[PDB]
């Protein structure tokens, strides 16, 4: 047959939400391709109305949920071809929020996804550019503002990645990052997206601190670091420290000036595997998968 | 004048017009090179049978 119409692709997604999220830890791949289709079968038909807004939105939300669940359950899902669809769905949304704005319409749920958009690339000044062009009320919504803080806070004039151009006077506020992350005001799904930066944020935190220490300074107690960079448990610190060759003393502290890497990304070495924050895992268990996904108003 | 650069269009669909020769219209024996090819195809066939 041809392409499925609006309301049945809505109802299709519904079934996935109401019955198959609870099985996400193992093979999201299924749910992935079946969502890819819905987002596809709506562009093929060139239908950019409420049905498409809503469905694309939730697929973004679901994609977010998957990001956490795959890391916690620490089942292997991909080296994140996940972020792409998540991205490809976010630009699709952007376009739709845009023409609706042109047609004098209004989307109830834009700020949320403008905010998610702001967090996908986090160091890309491109997105700082766009968000200044948007309407006052979109710019000033709590969700967009918070995401701006996170970008402002994550910025670091020392970030080293090939292709990346370093910029002047960057905050490198690792302190207010883990601060903000624990805020009971931060939306959960939004927190999940941000967890994808725990390592690099941390690496440049230690490399920054280590730099201020004079040579004869004593090793820094794990307990200190643990709190500074809100690690989950002393086990994660150990693993962090051997992955970057930060020699440990007494299995109890780290000699920071032994950290001699310029970039968080080591030369042809498999990234330290993605982690999470207890803080938000806790939040997840006290709630329902479906509940997260139909957050926000009706289109 | 003569260069490959478009001159200026002045100042202010029908599709068809097939400009490609769909099938040829030449007589194959009225072309010299073409018969020398046949003529020596014969010489080969006659001999190396």
């Amino acid at each position: 047959s041809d392409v499925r119409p609006p309301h049945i692709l809505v109802k299709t997604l519904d079934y996935i939400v109401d019955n198959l999220l609870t099985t996400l830890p193992e093979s999201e791949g299924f749910l992935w391709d079946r969502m890819r289709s819905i987002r596809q079968d709506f562009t093929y038909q060139n239908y950019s109305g409420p049905e498409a807004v809503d469905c694309n939105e939730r697929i973004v939300r679901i994609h977010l949920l998957i990001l956490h669940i795959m890391v916690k359950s620490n089942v292997e899902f991909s080296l994140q071809q996940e972020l792409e669809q998540l991205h490809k769905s976010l630009i699709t949304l952007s376009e739709i929020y845009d023409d609706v704005r042109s047609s004098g319409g209004t989307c109830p749920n834009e700020a949320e996804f403008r905010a998610y958009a702001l967090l996908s690339k986090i160091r890309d000044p491109q997105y700082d550019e766009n968000i200044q062009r948007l309407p006052k009320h979109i710019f000033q919504d709590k969700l967009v503002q918070m995401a701006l803080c996170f970008r402002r806070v994550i910025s670091n004039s020392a970030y080293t990645e090939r292709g990346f151009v370093k910029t002047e006077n960057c905050l490198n506020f690792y302190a207010r990052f883990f601060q903000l992350m624990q805020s009971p005001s931060l939306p959960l799904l939004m927190g999940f997206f941000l967890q994808m930066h725990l390592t690099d944020i941390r690496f440049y935190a230690l490399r920054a601190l280590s730099h201020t220490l004079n040579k004869k300074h004593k090793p820094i107690p794990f307990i200190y670091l643990e709190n500074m960079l809100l690690f989950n448990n002393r086990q994660e610190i150990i693993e962090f420290c051997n992955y970057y060759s930060i020699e440990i003393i007494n299995g109890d502290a780290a000699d920071l000036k032994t950290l001699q890497h310029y970039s968080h990304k080591l030369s042809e070495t498999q990234p330290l595997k993605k982690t999470y924050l207890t803080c938000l895992e806790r939040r997840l268990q006290k709630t329902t998968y479906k509940g997260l996904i139909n957050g926000g108003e009706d289109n | 004048e003569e260069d490959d650069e478009f001159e200026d269009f002045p100042i202010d669909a029908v599709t068809q017009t097939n400009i490609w020769e769909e099938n040829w219209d030449d007589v194959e024996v009225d072309d010299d090179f073409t018969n020398e090819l046949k003529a020596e195809l014969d010489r080969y066939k006659r001999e190396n049978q």
């Binding site: - | 478009f6 599709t15 090179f33 090819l37």
Partner: protein, 286 residues
């Protein structure tokens, strides 16, 4: 929208790059057109603006030997210039400009022009000069093709056409040549297999004097690439290009094709065969 002279500006600019001996600087302008946002506006500018653009874009491709790539562009150009409202003596002169590239682009892709529609754009001497090359190619006269390029060398070079032809025209000319053989040998004389010794003397007639064959001794681009002594190879390419459906037996010294009276099962129509191995769509402007 409030970008109404963008295309005008683009062409004005790309033309300059061509006027200097450095048109590779165009791709960066061309590339600025695949943003989703603007690709969908290229169709909103004046048509004569699109035509000019497609012309430059077409010539660009050809400079990089991307023939079909170039073709679809020249095609859209001239087709669009034909259902152009007016006819000033400049518009036709531009159509002339387009054809000077469209003719050889098409030939390489195994396509030849219906001179009917083009009569008002070209001088009969041009039509004749292409006409003669048109047949040399058609009947598989390699030496004919060479000596035509040799005459026409100088102002073919002036248009960056000398070389692309010198390399890309051969294999078409070869298809035709071997097809005439195959026809009269395996469909008319029903002779399944063709020994290399056969193609050998066929190739001698077609190719003519080679590099240091008696009389010719300086290598030249016109007598240095083609030698009848290379039977097996000219077949292997023809088969790899999908221009011919056959097989080779290096030590048996023969080429085997399918036994059949229908010629286009063994030598398929040259054009579609090329376009299949080198697809190229029209709304890519870079």
């Amino acid at each position: 929208g409030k970008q109404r002279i963008l295309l005008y500006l683009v062409n004005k600019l790309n033309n300059i790059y061509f006027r200097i001996e450095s048109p590779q600087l165009c791709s960066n302008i061309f590339k600025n057109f695949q943003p989703k946002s603007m690709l969908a506006h290229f169709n909103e500018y004046q048509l004569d603006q699109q035509i000019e653009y497609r012309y430059l874009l077409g010539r660009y491709y050809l400079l990089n030997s991307q023939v079909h790539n170039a073709f679809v562009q020249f095609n859209e150009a001239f087709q669009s210039l034909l259902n152009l409202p007016l006819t000033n003596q400049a518009i036709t002169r531009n159509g002339t400009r387009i054809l000077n590239y469209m003719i050889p682009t098409g030939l390489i892709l195994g396509k030849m022009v219906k001179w009917g529609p083009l009569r008002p754009f070209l001088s009969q001497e041009t039509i004749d000069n292409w006409s003669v090359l048109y047949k040399h190619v058609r009947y598989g006269n390699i030496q004919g093709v060479s000596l035509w390029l040799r005459q026409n060398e100088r102002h073919l070079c002036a248009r960056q056409l000398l070389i692309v032809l010198l390399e890309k025209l051969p294999m078409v000319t070869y298809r035709n040549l071997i097809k005439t053989v195959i026809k009269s040998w395996t469909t008319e004389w029903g002779q399944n297999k063709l020994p290399y010794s056969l193609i050998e003397r066929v190739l001698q007639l077609s190719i003519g004097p080679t590099f240091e064959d008696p009389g010719a001794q300086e290598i030249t681009i016109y007598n240095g690439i083609h030698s009848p002594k290379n039977v097996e190879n000219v077949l292997v390419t023809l088969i790899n290009l999908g221009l011919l459906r056959a097989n080779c037996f290096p030590q048996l010294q023969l080429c085997v094709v399918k036994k059949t009276t229908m010629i286009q099962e063994i030598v398929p129509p040259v054009n579609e065969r090329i376009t299949k191995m080198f697809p190229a769509h029209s709304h890519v402007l870079w």
